[PDB]
Amino acid sequence: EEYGYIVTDQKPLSLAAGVKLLEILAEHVHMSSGSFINISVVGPALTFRIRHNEQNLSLADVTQQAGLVKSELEAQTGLQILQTGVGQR
Amino acid sequence: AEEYGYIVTDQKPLSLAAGVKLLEILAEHVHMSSGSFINISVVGPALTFRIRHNEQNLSLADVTQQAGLVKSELEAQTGLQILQTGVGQRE
Amino acid sequence: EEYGYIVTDQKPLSLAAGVKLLEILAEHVHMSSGSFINISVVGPALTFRIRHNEQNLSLADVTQQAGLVKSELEAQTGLQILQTGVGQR
Amino acid sequence: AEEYGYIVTDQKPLSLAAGVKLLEILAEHVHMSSGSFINISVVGPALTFRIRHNEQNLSLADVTQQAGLVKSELEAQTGLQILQTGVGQRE
Ligand SMILES: [Ca+2]
Ligand SMILES: [Ca+2]
Ligand SMILES: [Ca+2]
Numbered sequence: 001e002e003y004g005y006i007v008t009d010q011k012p013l014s015l016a017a018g019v020k021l022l023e024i025l026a027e028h029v030h031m032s033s034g035s036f037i038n039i040s041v042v043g044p045a046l047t048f049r050i051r052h053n054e055q056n057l058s059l060a061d062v063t064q065q066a067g068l069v070k071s072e073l074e075a076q077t078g079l080q081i082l083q084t085g086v087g088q089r
Numbered sequence: 090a091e092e093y094g095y096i097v098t099d100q101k102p103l104s105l106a107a108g109v110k111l112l113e114i115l116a117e118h119v120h121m122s123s124g125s126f127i128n129i130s131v132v133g134p135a136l137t138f139r140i141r142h143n144e145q146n147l148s149l150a151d152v153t154q155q156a157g158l159v160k161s162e163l164e165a166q167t168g169l170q171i172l173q174t175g176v177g178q179r180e
Numbered sequence: 181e182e183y184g185y186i187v188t189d190q191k192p193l194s195l196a197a198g199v200k201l202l203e204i205l206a207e208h209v210h211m212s213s214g215s216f217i218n219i220s221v222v223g224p225a226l227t228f229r230i231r232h233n234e235q236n237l238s239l240a241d242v243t244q245q246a247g248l249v250k251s252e253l254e255a256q257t258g259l260q261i262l263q264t265g266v267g268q269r
Numbered sequence: 270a271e272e273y274g275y276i277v278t279d280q281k282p283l284s285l286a287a288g289v290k291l292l293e294i295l296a297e298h299v300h301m302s303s304g305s306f307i308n309i310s311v312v313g314p315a316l317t318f319r320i321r322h323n324e325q326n327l328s329l330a331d332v333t334q335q336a337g338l339v340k341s342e343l344e345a346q347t348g349l350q351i352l353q354t355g356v357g358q359r360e
């Protein structure tokens with residue numbers, strides 16, 4: 001029951017902005033954003049799981065990639081990314 | 090500011106001794122000296138750290154991924170629960 | 181960007197032993213050891229900074245105290261303390 | 270062996286003249302005769318010294334603390350960098 005996390009500077013993080021982060025991330029990792037499932041925004045954090053996918057992208061993979069392209073993610077979504085990781089919710 | 094790795098626990102607050110024990114276990118797992126974990130702090134429930142240059146070329150992403158793989162061992166050996174692990178960086 | 185230093189006879193100083201020194205020191209100065217932050221062991225040396233605290237203990241204060249109780253520190257950590265001070269790292 | 274004070278510089282090696290200049294500046298700051306700094310040596314980048322009995326009751330802790338307070342003056346007047354200051358004692 002682990003989830004991927006992207007923690008932002010938002011209070012609160014809007015749901016629309018959270019899934020926009022996922023859209024940009026999905027484009028970058030070459031996966032459909034529909035593969036991000038069980039999505040919730042909780043306080044400043046976006047949380048999600050990941051459906052089975054052809055490239056075998058894990059929660060660790062996508063959260064690592066979110067960290068790598070965070071400036072791209074931010075520029076398009078009007079927020080800052082402070083942490084990315086994996087954990088319970 | 091540079092990236093840091095972190096582990097959020099269920100401890101209120103996390104003891105310095107327990108935070109370092111997590112790192113000792115993690116170090117032995119990755120076959121790196123625990124002295125290579127640098128700039129360590131415990132703040133509230135969380136442990137934060139960076140990683141020194143090493144021949145293994147282990148990154149913060151590498152170590153936090155590895156912490157996920159050995160999460161049950163980390164918990165069993167320390168008596169605490171790990172709620173989140175990841176990489177952060179201030180704006 | 182100054183740090184407190186405790187230089188030991190260790191090669192290398194173990195991280196666990198370094199924070200055990202800090203635990204004993206914290207007990208002696210009546211501060212939480214969690215107030216020792218930015219901790220690194222480098223060769224034989226333990227280095228650290230200090231978070232704001234109620235007694236207004238500085239790096240000079242705690243390194244001076246470490247010198248004063250060094251025999252207590254050593255007896256419990258299986259090492260010798262050779263120097264204490266403040267400096268860059 | 271008794272405690273000694275020390276100042277580690279960026280000099281490779283530290284000159285005797287520069288080491289003593291640090292002490293002259295430090296002495297004038299603490300309003301003590303620089304002759305009260307005794308058993309002086311420069312070894313590699315470091316200056317080591319002890320302090321003679323004085324009416325002011327100035328200790329090695331006192332003087333090394335004071336060296337921290339006037340670090341920028343010590344550096345500006347000598348042209349070197351101070352990397353560490355402290356008190357040591359052999360085992
Ligand atoms: Ca993968
Ligand atoms: Ca940013
Ligand atoms: Ca658990």
Ligand SMILES: [Ca+2]
Binds near residue numbers: 235237238
């Ligand atoms: Ca004080």
Ligand SMILES: [Ca+2]
Binds near residue numbers: 250251254260261360
């Ligand atoms: Ca001793």
Ligand SMILES: [Ca+2]
Binds near residue numbers: 344350351
């Ligand atoms: Ca300087």
